[PDB]
């Protein structure tokens with residue numbers, strides 16, 4: 001488990017996080033569509049869920065939960081009723097599954113025989129292990145992650161895979177990446193959205209650029225700001241169910257309080273990537289434009 005190391009049992013910290021969320025409900029009262037009692041029911045649904053508990057405690061996703069959430073097939077599995085609504089209806093969850101699809105299409109398009117593909121942070125390597133390698137013999141896969149549990153999980157997920165022997169894993173802080181021209185393709189999801197400082201994200205992109213061979217490509221992603229937050233929000237409100245958005249807003253803002261709130265526009269992301277040395281940017285937007293994918297080229 002992610003915790004201890006807080007030196008306490010996770011159950012003790014969880015009770016605290018639940019108490020704090022309950023107080024925020026009681027002190028702030030009703031919201032449109034969800035009275036106090038209903039909010040308390042939502043909090044209980046979170047606390048009864050394995051993923052819900054992880055989010056209450058840690059306020060972000062790790063390798064395990066990114067994989068399990070992103071690869072969830074709607075209607076499948078053993079989920080409690082409310083838990084299933086969270087897995088299947090929240091606009092941001094729908095968006096990250098769309099994004100996952102765009103990552104797969106982009107990586108597949110750019111794959112060539114013998115190429116070296118890196119994922120940073122690799123997590124369980126869900127996207128790379130899902131690709132079709134039938135016409136790309138000799139691909140080498142590289143996974144970098146700072147979480148030893150992520151690397152263990154990648155190994156376990158790849159154990160029966162055709163490319164199990166083509167994987168090299170490294171425990172490294174992604175923010176300190178210093179590979180020089182080692183990869184043809186690099187994919188990254190779930191780092192920039194946790195870093196509110198724009199310059200720190202630009203520097204991460206620069207390390208990605210430095211790690212790519214000339215002519216290589218980066219596939220990454222970013223969460224975008226909603227209309228309340230930015231005059232330049234790309235959100236298509238006609239592509240978002242109003243009630244499910246209200247549900248997400250209550251769950252995120254009041255209950256979980258997620259750490260993935262470094263939201264950036266297409267133009268901001270373009271500026272960062274161009275500063276880092278990338279050209280020929282292509283954006284692959286999800287339907288509501290909550291979580292675009294970007295493919296960025298390093299000049300030959």
Ligand SMILES: CCCCCCCCCCCCCCCC(=O)O
Nearest residue numbers: 049051052061083086092096190260
């Ligand atoms: C079942 C408990 C509630 C589940 C709530 C899941 C909300 C996840 C939102 C995922 C998309 C945006 C955040 C991505 C963050 C990341 O990739 O690390």
